[PDB]
C-alpha cells in the first residue's frame, strides 16, 4: 500500500496523487482524469 503520483501522457505533468495496494495492483495504474493545462479529460498513468 503505497502513494502514487499520476502523470499525464500528453503533458507529463503530475496532476494527482493517490494510493494503491502494490500487490493487488502491481502495474502502473491508468485512469482518466482532468488535466487543467489542457482543460479536458486525459489519461494519466502512474510514474
Amino acid at each position: 500500500r503505497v502513494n502514487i503520483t499520476l502523470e499525464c501522457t500528453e503533458c507529463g505533468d503530475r496532476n494527482y496523487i493517490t494510493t494503491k495496494n502494490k500487490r493487488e495492483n502491481p502495474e502502473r495504474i491508468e485512469l482518466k482524469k482532468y488535466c487543467p493545462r489542457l482543460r479536458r479529460v486525459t489519461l494519466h498513468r502512474e510514474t
Binding site: N21, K22, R23, P26
Partner: protein
C-alpha cells in the same frame, strides 16, 4: 566500464534488489549468486537494458552480449546444442562485457570444460550466474551475493567467498553470544537492585516502630538511588544495540502424498533390443533390459546422445518399450513445455492435481512458494520456480513412475539436496537425467548408459 548507482529493483510489493553504488572494470571476472527467487536474472536484464529499474541508473560502455537463462528457441536440436549455439552466438558478436545466466544448465563435462577454458582465454569483462562451484572457481575473481535485498561483495574465487562467509557467520554468532550474555548479566543486576530497593523500606525485626519511622525518608532516597542504577542499566542496554540473531535459512524437503505402493520387483518397463533413429540417422542400439518398481534409474549420455528422444519414445508407447499397465507415468522436459504459460500456477497445478487442495498447498509449501506467488503467471517465474512447479505438479498427479529429463538445471544447493532426498526416498519408480556427477552419484541405484551408439543397463552406481 559499467556504472550502477542508486539502483532499486522492485518486483510487485517486495523490494528485489537495492544498491547504493557498484562499478565493474575491464578485465573483470564476476560471479553473481543467490538462492532462487532473489533477483539475479532481473538485475542482469536491467543491466542489459532488457528491463527497466524503478530507480537509479546503469551506464554501459561498449558492446554487451546477453545469454539468457531460458531458451525460447523452440527447434529441432538438443538442449545442449541450443545452449552452446546461443553462447557461441554471444561470443561471435565480439562483446566488451559478456552477460550470462546459468550457462552450464544443460551442458555436460566436455562442454563445460571447453566453455571454462574459452572464457579463461577470453579477455574483457564478463558477468556470470551459475551454481556450478567449480566453474565459478575456475572463472571469477569477484563475487556478488544478492542476500537480504542487498549486494554483498566478496573477492577471489567461490573458495575465498565461502571462507569470508564463514568468518562472517562465526563473527555474528560471537556477537550475539556476547550481547545475550551482557543482557542477562545486567538484567540480572537489575533484578538484584529491585530486590534491594524492595528491602530498603521493610524494617528489620531488630528495629522499633518509632526508631524505624525516623529514617523512612533516607531509606526512600536509598531506594531512589537503586532505581536510578536500574535506569542507568537500561540505558546501557540500549547502547548495546539491537544486535540481530543470525539468519538460519530453512531447509527444503519435499513432502510427497502416498500415491500407490505397487510391489518392489514388479516389471515396470520391458524394453527389447532395437536400433533407433529420429531423422533416419542412427542414434544408438538398445540392448534389451527391464526396469522394476522402486528402481532409481539414472540415464547417462553426452550431448545429443538420444536421451530425451528415448524418453519421448517411452511416453509415446513404442511397442518395443512396454510399460506395464498401472504404471502412471509423469514427465518432466528439458525445456519446460509441460506448463501452460497462460495459467497462474494455482490454476496450472490445481487442474493437474488429482489430490486435495490442502495436499496441493503442502507440496507447494515444501517447494517453498510463498502466498504471494500463487497468482503469478508462469511467464513471471524464475528458471528454478518453473522447475519446482512442474515437479510439484508431477508429485500431485497420482504417478507411480516419474521420468525427469534434467531437473538439476536452475536449482540451488538446497533444492538439489531436497530433490536428491526426494528421488532417494521415493516410494514409486523414477528415471532421471542429469549431467551432475554429484547428484547422480548421490542418487543412482541403477544406471542406463549411452556410449559409442550403444545403450546398456547396469544395476550398479
Amino acid at each position: 566500464t559499467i556504472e550502477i548507482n542508486q539502483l532499486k529493483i522492485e518486483v510487485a510489493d517486495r523490494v528485489l534488489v537495492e544498491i547504493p553504488h557498484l562499478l565493474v572494470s575491464k578485465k573483470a571476472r564476476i560471479g553473481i549468486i543467490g538462492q532462487n527467487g532473489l533477483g539475479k536474472t532481473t538485475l542482469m536484464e536491467v543491466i542489459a537494458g532488457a528491463k527497466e529499474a524503478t530507480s537509479g541508473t546503469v551506464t554501459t560502455q561498449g558492446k554487451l552480449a546477453y545469454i539468457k537463462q531460458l531458451s525460447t528457441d523452440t527447434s529441432t536440436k538438443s538442449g545442449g546444442e541450443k545452449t552452446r549455439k546461443a553462447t557461441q552466438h554471444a561470443m561471435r558478436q565480439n562483446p566488451s562485457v559478456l552477460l550470462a545466466d546459468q550457462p552450464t544448465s544443460n551442458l555436460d563435462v566436455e562442454s563445460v570444460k571447453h566453455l571454462e577454458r574459452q572464457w579463461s582465454d577470453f579477455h574483457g569483462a564478463l558477468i556470470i550466474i551459475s551454481h556450478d562451484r567449480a566453474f565459478l572457481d575456475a572463472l571469477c575473481t569477484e563475487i556478488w551475493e544478492i542476500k537480504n535485498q542487498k549486494i554483498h561483495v566478496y573477492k577471489g574465487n567461490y573458495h575465498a567467498y565461502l571462507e569470508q562467509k564463514q568468518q562472517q557467520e562465526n563473527q555474528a554468532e560471537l556477537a550475539y553470544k556476547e550481547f545475550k550474555n551482557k543482557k542477562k548479566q545486567l538484567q540480572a543486576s537489575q533484578t538484584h537492585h529491585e530486590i534491594e530497593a524492595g528491602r530498603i523500606v521493610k524494617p528489620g525485626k531488630r528495629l522499633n516502630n518509632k526508631e524505624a519511622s525516623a529514617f523512612k525518608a533516607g531509606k526512600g532516597t536509598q531506594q531512589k538511588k537503586q532505581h536510578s542504577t536500574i535506569k542507568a542499566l537500561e540505558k546501557r542496554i540500549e547502547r548495546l544495540g539491537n544486535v540481530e540473531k543470525p539468519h538460519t535459512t530453512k531447509p527444503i524437503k519435499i513432502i510427497t502424498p502416498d500415491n500407490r505402493v505397487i510391489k518392489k520387483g514388479n516389471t515396470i518397463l520391458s524394453a527389447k533390443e532395437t536400433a533407433y533413429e529420429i531423422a533416419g540417422r542412427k542414434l544408438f542400439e538398445t540392448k534389451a533390459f527391464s526396469i522394476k518398481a522402486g528402481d532409481k534409474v539414472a540415464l547417462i549420455g553426452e550431448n545429443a546422445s538420444g536421451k530425451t528422444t528415448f524418453l519421448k519414445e517411452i511416453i509415446q508407447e513404442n511397442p518395443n518399450l512396454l510399460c506395464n499397465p498401472q504404471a502412471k507415468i509423469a514427465y518432466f522436459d528439458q525445456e519446460l513445455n509441460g506448463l501452460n504459460q497462460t495459467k497462474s500456477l494455482l490454476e496450472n497445478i490445481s487442474e493437474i492435481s488429482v489430490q486435495t487442495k490442502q495436499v496441493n498447498r503442502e507440496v507447494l509449501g515444501s517447494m517453498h512458494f510463498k502466498e504471494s506467488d500463487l497468482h503469478k503467471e508462469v511467464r513471471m517465474l524464475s528458471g528454478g520456480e518453473r522447475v519446482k512447479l512442474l515437479l510439484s505438479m508431477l508429485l500431485l498427479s497420482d504417478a507411480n513412475f516419474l521420468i525427469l529429463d534434467q531437473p538439476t538445471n536452475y536449482l540451488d544447493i538446497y533444492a538439489m539436496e531436497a530433490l536428491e532426498t526426494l528421488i532417494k526416498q521415493f516410494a514409486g519408480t523414477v528415471l532421471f537425467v542429469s549431467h551432475d556427477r554429484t547428484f547422480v552419484n548421490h542418487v543412482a541405484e541403477q544406471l542406463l548408459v549411452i556410449e559409442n551408439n550403444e545403450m546398456n543397463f547396469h544395476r550398479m552406481t
